[PDB]
Specification:
The structure is cut from a larger assembly and holds chains A (430 residues), B (77 residues), C (199 residues), D (434 residues), E (49 residues) and F (369 residues). Chain D is an alpha/beta fold. Chain D has helices at residues 11-28, 67-75, 100-104, 110-123, 139-155, 178-192, 201-212, 219-234, 248-254, 283-291, 320-332, 380-394, 401-404, 411-430; strands at 3-9, 48-50, 56-58, 60-64, 87-89, 127-135, 160-166, 195-198, 262-268, 307-316, 346-351, 368-376. The chains are: A alpha/beta (430), B mainly alpha (77), C mainly alpha (199), D alpha/beta (434), E mainly alpha (49), F alpha+beta (369). Bound molecules: guanosine-5'-triphosphate, guanosine-5'-diphosphate and magnesium ion (MG). Chain F: It is an enzyme of class 2 (transferase). Chain F: It catalyses: a 2'-deoxyribonucleoside 5'-diphosphate + ATP = a 2'-deoxyribonucleoside 5'-triphosphate + ADP.
């Protein structure tokens, strides 16, 4: 029933995906042993979207795990919820990529992807009706960015009509932990613009900032950050699994949110986020929820939207509420901040309502926005790229195994063109 | 940011009244491990989401047919 | 008569018709479960013999009344007259799950203890003091002014509210579902107090 | 003998048909299971048909491509009422795209829908017409409704069609690409519908607020109001009264020209259970509240235009003598103005049955009510603002690739725009004096 | 063929009114009988005062 | 000080729907105040109405400002705890040897402080009286008691009060009446007992026995026929205000002592349309029907049947004029003069026509049964 399959690659995808399947299993009332122990009948009506039922009555997720090393796959198997994943869905090499884009995309990626493409193909035709794909990986790494983008290309030529989503962890220079980020960041971005239908960029610095200020947690960990990302992921497909007043699936998001084919990079956010020690001292109302979700410091990207103008935004409300407030608040925030919304498109905000909120919460909102302020990520990456490519430093590894500087020039050129056109409509008037 | 610093491990009490002492106390009270359990595993659910009010309401479409007026069953005349 | 293997023959006949209508990717338990929920309008969770006969008629397995009574009687062990289709559907799921020594079929044949609502009550009761468990037993006895051994719907709400637990509607439904198995309208507090205290 | 067939396509159509059929069942005393305890005139024959022994089944058909709303209808309290194969459910949602529901995925459901409607018509013997409830600013609503209208208009011919559409509000709306689908649906319905009623959402929000003192309105209240309007309009077809009006006396009184059949509705009295019994509720004042501009269910100001024809359907204990005095006072009033070539502009229908009230609702139990369907030249404002919205975003060809890539030809936008402009010009010309 | 049912229905509603007036008249005389009884007694009670 | 808060529920007539309020009761100075669930507005604020403490209980009906309210349940733990103690039920039974002492038995029960929730008089047949007292069988007391029970009319009762299961017995006295005279002379049996098997009344011993008897006697599924005649008799109704004022014991004995044989009496709760049709003989008739009809449904009432050689006028002689103010002057020793207070609450009500007494008693014991 318009079910979606999940593909997770690299170290980020494995860690984010593992935390993601914990939230969904909790939401659907599935124990780590795979046996249903839920509460309401609503939890089984659309369980086929994310799970497959095996003989014997246990439900197994339809996920594929990717890596060039067994370093992270053994830990997730040994960790909690690690028995859900089918062992035939684990595919890995024995060499690793070593933070090299070409190794995961030309030499080792090419030889290994033949096996995994068989697993995805078997998973897709087994189910009745596909709805699309969703991808979790990293662009600043070797195996995630290298092999990950190759499979996007491979599956795109086989399923040209199905939608496809990505949750991309693009690097930020403030959290400097790799010296070769600008090279393989641009290459992945160049390949991602012709194939991916929806891209949602994520930054660690933005995630770290939210934990310190909003949650007021003295010292966080990847476990906390992985949960925030997983929260946004489940909120996007909320109306695809539960009854509501205004249902909206993945395709309905793209139609409302993508004006032009090359403008499909988004920045997301989640609300409400509240510290443990101050939860009972504030009220949960739609005016409060809408106030935080437009806060410039609440989104998962370091870019400030107040430095650009929104083209289109979408809000996916959850829980029990009245549509009058939802429609009135969207109009209210669109009028008092008319300088932040581009004029030549009227009513550029979409709203949707789903009756079932996440467990333990009354109301929640997932915000997905398409603003010109995302050019800062590409502008800043390009600046570091040309500063390092000028001296041809750190270059012989790529060129020594079938890579050429020509498509380095091509990748930088196309991304620079994307930046120019993306902020062109900021200055455009009717 | 100079957190941790001059407040090491402790159980119960207000602490040393420096930095983030207040927020950590309620976190410590609700779950034993108020600051980054060393590598008593930590569950990210309560630290991020918060207190859970578990309840699953109706879909508002199974709300049309059900509606009852107690007065209409009176014997009248 | 129909005490002998004729009783189990109808199950095989009934199982085949369930399998024929079984949707792809689904077990036989869900297929027959939706049939029973379709008929009962109270949504209580239990059905009588008249509803049970109608549900079988939907699948096409219509027999004479004397055969239908035995099928109802076999599963209605307590002879209360109200069967739970939760146990009925689970029984047929294991029948179609096949026989395999390597894999267990789990499934459900009896309503489980709810679990976390009981555990939360036990943890909260420990905060009041050493005699908190006395108060819960004392409250039930004093609220039950008539000494009958059971409490009603609203009375159970008051006893929990008197202690100081503001449980939500869903939590009451789960707790009341297991303890009042066939919906007599009353719950035996003696069983409830035993489970919350422990072993 | 006399029956209507109601078509419910789209999320809004189904979510309002829920309230419509709830109200019909409660009004005719039919239990949700289908049996009528009664305790016998055949006043239900319009909406329900007997099975020969016991239950009554509606003459209803439900269409949608996403199974979400259909499944919950099959699951809820009305599971035993509707015919199991009369709730048609598709596979993939149209996803807010007009071209999707009209060219590629909506072409595989019209065959089934036409087969079911043909079976229903064959079962019927004295079919009066069709009632269509659909959403305009959506994908599967506009496109599939347009395709169904095109099919029916050639398949059946002269049978009357009445539509209750939901136009986008000037400022309060959900989708962003809604101007395209709205314009295309207007071009489709202009030639194939005989009566259209505007039912935008923001106006009803103001009605509920200002009347019922409710600060948290929801779609349920709006659907209940729409169902009340439908029942008040169709009561005279099935209940006894002094002056009876059927649907062919409706068009003949309300459609001056073939291309002018767009109308908007008003309802009164709409009062809570607290303020109802301190107020007079006379016939003279409910007809004033009906003509009050703020009480109409479409966000339009009648004071900027003229009136061409008004239909007034009274139900309750109304006396024909008082209606004449109230109409005379209304005509004497100078704020409300008519067109010169329309000396008489009122058609009156009276029904004996008092309005029915649903338990747990917001409206009180009253003894008199009136619903007024009026044709006016002021409706051109909504088309004007929709055209203004369309041209502003079509200059840079925004979201066009979503439509061309599915099979829509780009040249249809220009045709729809020209048709809307011609309709506006036709409305402008009629309003002038002679 | 439905005219048979209409005729019987009119017969019943015609007869109920016919039987209603007889019942009302029989109860109306008790209204007058009790009024005279209490009326005389008040005169007796007043005279005793 | 301390506050008692209930939930009340009033049925409107002009509006079909029914409403609900709080009816806060400041017991420090006995003042009434009502607040409503919906629309959050104070209804009636801090005004005294002289509402007594004893009438506050679940299911009670109290009238304020011409709109009568019905308590349905409590609203908080503090209010619930105070009044949940007074909920005990017990089965009081009057044996057919103390038939002439019914009024005296009832009165001292009333001054004991207990409350009679329900009451009815009937004759237990041979078979059901044998099933009753079923725990005895082998004892020789069983056969004698079974033969005694089916002798004549019996009065059954259900008492509600604090510690009623044992407070009933301690005034009831020792089970043997002979030893009662020297141990506790002031007791039911000490005053009205002859011997062991002919003791005055019967009481409940265990709560399980209380359940067994109460469902045997006052439940809907009961096989006890309301044994009553319908010839040579009139009906008299004890108005609710007498029940509230606690004189019902002082009226039954006074009626019995005048030579009138009572055949059946039962407890009734009736609504306004039902009470309206009872006085249909008084509809547009002299006595200003509205107030007397409204008051009759303002609470619990006792309905009695009186049998005598000349039932109608002879009983009407001892009832007196329907106005107690004029009765007191001229007929000082009549029921209405001694018990009635004003025109609308004139104590007892008796039919006052020779021929309509047969249907008057038939309405309560056949039509309304
Ligand atoms: N008043 C009212 N309007 C509704 C309701 N449901 C949907 N709508 C209208 O429908 C419009 C959006 O289209 P939907 O009905 O949600 O979806 P659709 O028409 O079925 O088309 P798809 O999105 O392709 O499925 C909104 O702008 C609403 O105005 C409802 O229950 N009440
Ligand atoms: N938010 C988050 N970021 C992670 C996690 N694991 C790794 N990262 C980030 O990913 C970057 C390294 O990417 P890497 O794993 O080497 O990519 P790969 O080699 O292709 O798998 C680092 O900068 C980390 O900040 C995680 O669990 N959560
Ligand atoms: Mg839809």
């Amino acid at each position: 029933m318009r079910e979606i399959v999940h593909i997770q690659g690299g170290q980020c995808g494995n860690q984010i995906g593992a935390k993601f399947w914990e939230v969904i299993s909790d939401e659907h009332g599935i124990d780590p042993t795979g046996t249903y122990h839920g509460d309401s009948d609503l939890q089984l009506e659309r369980i086929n979207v994310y799970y497959n039922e095996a003989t014997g009555g246990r439900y197994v997720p339809r996920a594929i795990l990717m890596d060039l090393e067994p370093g992270t796959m053994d830990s997730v198997r040994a960790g909690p919820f690690g028995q859900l994943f089918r062992p035939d869905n684990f595919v890995f090499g024995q060499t690793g990529a070593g933070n090299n884009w070409a190794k995961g995309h030309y030499t080792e990626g090419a030889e290994l992807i033949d096996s995994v493409l068989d697993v995805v193909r078997k998973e897709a035709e087994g189910c009745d009706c596909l709805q699309g794909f969703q991808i979790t990986h990293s662009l600043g790494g070797g195996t995630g960015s290298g092999m990950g983008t190759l499979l996007i290309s491979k599956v795109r030529e086989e399923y040209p009509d199905r939608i496809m989503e990505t949750f991309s962890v693009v690097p930020s220079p403030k959290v400097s932990d790799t010296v070769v980020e600008p090279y393989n960041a641009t290459l992945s971005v160049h390949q991602l613009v012709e194939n991916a239908d929806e891209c949602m960029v994520i930054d660690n610095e933005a995630l770290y900032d939210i934990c310190f200020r909003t949650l007021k947690l003295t010292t966080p960990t990847y476990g906390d950050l992985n949960h925030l990302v997983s929260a946004a992921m489940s909120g996007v497909t909320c109306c695809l699994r539960f009854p509501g007043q205004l249902n909206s699936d993945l395709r309905k998001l793209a139609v409302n949110l993508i004006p032009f084919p090359r403008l499909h990079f988004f920045m997301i956010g989640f609300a409400p986020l509240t510290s443990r020690g101050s939860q009972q001292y504030r009220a949960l109302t739609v005016p409060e929820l809408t106030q935080q979700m437009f806060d410039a410091k609440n989104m998962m990207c370091a870019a400030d939207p107040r430095h650009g103008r929104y083209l289109t935004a979408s809000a996916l409300f959850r829980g029990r509420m009245s549509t009058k407030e939802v429609d009135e608040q969207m109009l209210n925030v669109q009028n008092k901040n008319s300088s932040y919304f581009v004029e030549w498109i009227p009513n550029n905000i979409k709203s949707s309502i789903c009756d079932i909120p996440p467990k333990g919460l009354k109301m929640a909102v997932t915000f997905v926005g398409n603003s010109t302020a995302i050019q800062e990520m590409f502008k800043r990456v390009a600046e570091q790229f040309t500063a390092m490519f000028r001296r041809k430093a750190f270059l012989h590894w790529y060129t020594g195994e079938g890579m050429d500087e020509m498509e380095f020039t091509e990748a930088e050129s196309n991304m620079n063109d994307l930046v120019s056109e993306y902020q062109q409509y900021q200055d455009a008037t009717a | 940011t100079t957190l941790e610093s001059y407040n090491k491990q402790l159980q119960k009490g207000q602490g040393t009244l420096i930095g983030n002492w207040w927020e950590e106390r309620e976190l410590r009270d609700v779950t034993g491990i108020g600051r980054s359990a060393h590598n008593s595993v930590n569950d990210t659910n309560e630290r991020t989401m918060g207190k859970k009010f578990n309840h699953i309401p109706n879909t508002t479409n199974s709300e049309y047919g059900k509606g009852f007026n107690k007065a209409d069953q009176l014997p009248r005349t | 008569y129909v005490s002998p293997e004729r009783l189990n023959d109808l199950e095989l006949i009934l199982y085949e018709k369930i399998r024929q209508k079984t949707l792809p990717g689904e077990d036989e338990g869900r297929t027959v479960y939706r049939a029973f929920k379709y008929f009962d309008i109270a949504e209580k969770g239990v059905i009588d013999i008249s509803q049970f006969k109608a549900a079988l008629e939907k699948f096409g397995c219509v027999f004479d009344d004397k055969e239908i009574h035995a099928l109802f009687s076999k599963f209605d062990v307590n002879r209360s007259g109200k069967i739970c289709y939760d146990e009925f559907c689970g029984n047929f799921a294991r029948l179609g799950s096949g026989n395999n020594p390597n894999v267990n079929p789990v499934f459900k044949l009896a309503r489980e203890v709810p679990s976390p609502i009981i555990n939360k009550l036990n943890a909260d009761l420990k905060k009041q003091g050493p005699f908190a468990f006395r108060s819960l037993s004392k409250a039930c006895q004093k609220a039950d002014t008539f000494l009958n051994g059971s409490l009603s719907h609203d009375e159970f709400k008051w006893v929990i509210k008197e202690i100081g637990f503001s449980l939500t509607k869903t939590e009451f439904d789960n707790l009341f579902k297991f303890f009042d198995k066939n919906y007599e309208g009353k719950v035996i507090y003696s069983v409830f107090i035993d489970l919350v205290r422990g072993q | 003998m006399r029956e209507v067939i109601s078509i419910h396509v789209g999320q809004g159509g189904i979510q309002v048909g829920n309230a419509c059929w709830e109200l019909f069942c409660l009004e005719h005393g039919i239990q949700p299971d289908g049996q009528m305890p009664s305790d016998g005139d055949d006043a239900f024959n319009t909406f329900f048909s007997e099975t020969g022994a016991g239950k009554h089944v509606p003459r209803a058909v439900f269409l949608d491509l996403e199974p979400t709303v259909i499944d919950e209808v099959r699951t809820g309290t009305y599971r035993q009422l509707f015919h199991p194969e009369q709730l048609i459910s598709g596979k993939e949602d149209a996803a807010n795209n007009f071209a999707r529901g009209h060219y590629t995925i909506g072409k595989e459901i019209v065959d089934l829908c036409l087969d079911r409607i043909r079976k229903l018509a064959d079962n019927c013997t004295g079919l009066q017409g069709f009632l269509v409830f659909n959403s305009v600013g959506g994908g599967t609503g506009s496109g599939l409704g347009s395709l169904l209208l095109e099919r029916l208009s050639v398949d059946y011919g002269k049978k009357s069609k009445l539509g209750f559409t939901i136009y986008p509000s000037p400022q309060v709306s959900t989708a962003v690409v809604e101007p395209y689908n709205s314009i295309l649906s207007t071009h489709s319905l202009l030639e194939h519908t005989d009566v259209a009623v505007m039912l935008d959402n923001e106006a009803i929000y103001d009605i509920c607020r200002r009347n019922l003192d409710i600060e948290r309105p929801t779609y349920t209240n709006l659907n209940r109001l729409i169902a009340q309007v439908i029942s008040s309009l169709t009561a005279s077809l099935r209940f006894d009264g002094a002056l009876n009006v059927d649907i062919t006396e409706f068009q003949t009184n309300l459609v001056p020209y073939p291309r002018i059949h767009f109308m908007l509705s008003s309802y009164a009295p709409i009062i809570s259970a607290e303020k109802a019994y301190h107020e007079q509720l006379s016939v003279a004042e409910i007809t004033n509240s009906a003509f009050e501009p703020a009480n109409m269910m479409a966000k339009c100001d009648p004071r900027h235009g003229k009136y061409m024809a008004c239909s007034m359907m009274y139900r309750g204990d109304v006396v024909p003598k008082d209606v004449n005095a109230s109409i005379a006072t209304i005509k004497t009033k100078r704020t409300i103005q008519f067109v010169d070539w329309c000396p008489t502009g009122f058609k009156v229908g009276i029904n004996y049955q008092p309005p029915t009230v649903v338990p747990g609702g917001d409206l009180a139990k009253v003894m008199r009510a009136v619903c007024m369907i009026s044709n006016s030249t002021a409706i051109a404002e909504v088309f004007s603002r929709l055209d203004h919205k369309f041209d502003l975003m079509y200059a840079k060809r925004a979201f066009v690739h979503w439509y061309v890539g599915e099979g829509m030809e780009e040249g249809e936008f220009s045709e729809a725009r020209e048709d809307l402009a011609a309709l506006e010009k036709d409305y402008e010309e009629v309003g002038i004096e002679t | 063929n439905r005219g048979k049912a209409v005729n019987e229905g009119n017969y019943i509603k015609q007869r109920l009114a016919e039987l209603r007036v007889r019942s009302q008249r029989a109860l109306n005389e008790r209204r007058q009988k009790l009024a005279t009884l209490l009326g005389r007694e008040h005169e007796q009670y007043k005279q005793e005062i | 000080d301390i506050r008692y808060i209930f939930i009340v529920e009033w049925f409107d007539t002009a509006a079909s729907l029914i409403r609900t309020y709080y009816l806060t009761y400041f017991t420090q100075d006995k003042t009434i105040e009502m607040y409503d669930l919906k629309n959050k507005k104070v209804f009636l604020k801090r005004c005294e109405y002289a509402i007594k403490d004893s009438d506050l209980y679940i299911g009670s009906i109290l009238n304020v400002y011409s709109r009568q309210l019905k308590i349905v349940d409590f609203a908080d733990v503090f209010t619930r705890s105070k009044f949940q103690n007074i909920k005990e039920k017990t089965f009081a039974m009057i044996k057919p040897d103390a038939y002439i002492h019914i009024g005296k038995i009832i009165s001292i029960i009333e001054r004991s402080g207990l409350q009679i929730s329900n009451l009815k008089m009937t004759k237990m047949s041979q078979e059901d009286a044998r099933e009753f007292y079923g725990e005895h069988k082998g004892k020789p007391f069983y056969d004698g008691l079974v033969n005694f029970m089916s002798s004549d009319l019996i009065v059954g009762m259900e008492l509600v009060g604090d510690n009623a299961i044992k407070r009933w017995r301690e005034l009831l006295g020792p089970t043997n009446t002979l030893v009662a005279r020297e141990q506790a002379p002031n007791s039911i049996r000490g005053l009205f007992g002859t011997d062991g098997t002919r003791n005055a009344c019967h009481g409940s011993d265990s709560p399980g026995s209380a359940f067994r008897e109460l469902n045997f006697f006052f439940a809907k599924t009961s096989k006890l026929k309301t044994q009553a005649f319908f010839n040579q008799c009139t009906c008299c109704v004890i108005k609710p205000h007498i029940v509230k004022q606690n004189q019902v014991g002082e009226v039954i004995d006074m009626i019995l002592s005048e030579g009138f044989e009572i055949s059946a009496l039962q407890t009734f709760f009736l609504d306004r349309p039902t009470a309206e049709e009872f006085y249909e003989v008084y509809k547009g008739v002299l006595p200003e029907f509205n107030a007397i009809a409204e008051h009759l449904t303002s609470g619990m009432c006792y309905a009695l049947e009186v049998r005598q050689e000349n039932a109608v006028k002879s009983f009407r002689d001892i009832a007196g004029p329907h106005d107690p103010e004029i009765a007191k002057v001229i007929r000082p020793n009549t029921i209405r003069a001694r018990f009635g207070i004003d025109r609308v609450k004139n104590g007892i009500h008796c039919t006052d026509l020779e021929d309509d007494g047969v249907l008057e008693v038939e309405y309560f014991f056949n039509a309304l049964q």
